[PDB]
Amino acid sequence: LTCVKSNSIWFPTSEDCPDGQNLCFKRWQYISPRMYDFTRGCAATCPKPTNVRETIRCCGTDKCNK
């Protein structure tokens, strides 16, 4: 699998996931209206929110987390 990788520093790029990681994730954290922190990458299992302002979506096709 290949996923989009991005975070607060790095602009979105393609990344090849390690063998055995067959999900891509997109995670967003609400700050205020229409203002979010986004993170994207590969995962083995879908990550879970660390706080109630976070939402995560996972998917299983190349770069589906764009």
Residue numbers in the entry: 1 to 66
Give passages from the manuscript.
The comparison of loop 3 from each of the two molecules in the asymmetric unit of MT7-1/3 compared to MT1 shows again an excellent match. The comparison of loop 2 from chain A of MT7-1/3 with loop 2 of MT1 shows that the replacement of loop 3 of MT7 for that of MT1 imposes a reorientation of the side chains to match that of MT1 although there is poor sequence identity. The situation with loop 3 is different because of the conserved interaction between loop 2 and the second strand of loop 3. To preserve the interaction we have observed that the side chain orientations on the top part of loop 2 tend to conform to those from the parent toxin. Indeed, in chimera MT7-1/3 the side chains on loop 2 execute a concerted rotation and adopt conformers that match closely those on MT1 loop 2. By least-squares fit we have an rmsd for MT1 vs MT7-1/3 of 2.87±0.08 Å while by SSM the value falls to an rmsd of 0.89 Å on 61 aligned residues with a 79% sequence identity. While loop 1 transfer has no significant effect on the toxin affinity for hM4, a moderate gain of function (5-fold) is observed with the grafting of loop 3.
This fold is characterized by three adjacent loops rich in β-pleated sheets emerging from a small globular core containing four invariant disulfide bridges. Despite high primary structure identity, often greater than 55%, muscarinic and adrenergic toxins exhibit distinct pharmacological profiles and clear functional differences. “Loop grafting” has been used to construct seven chimeric toxins to dissect how the affinity, selectivity and functionality for the muscarinic and adrenergic receptors depend on shuffling loops between various toxins.
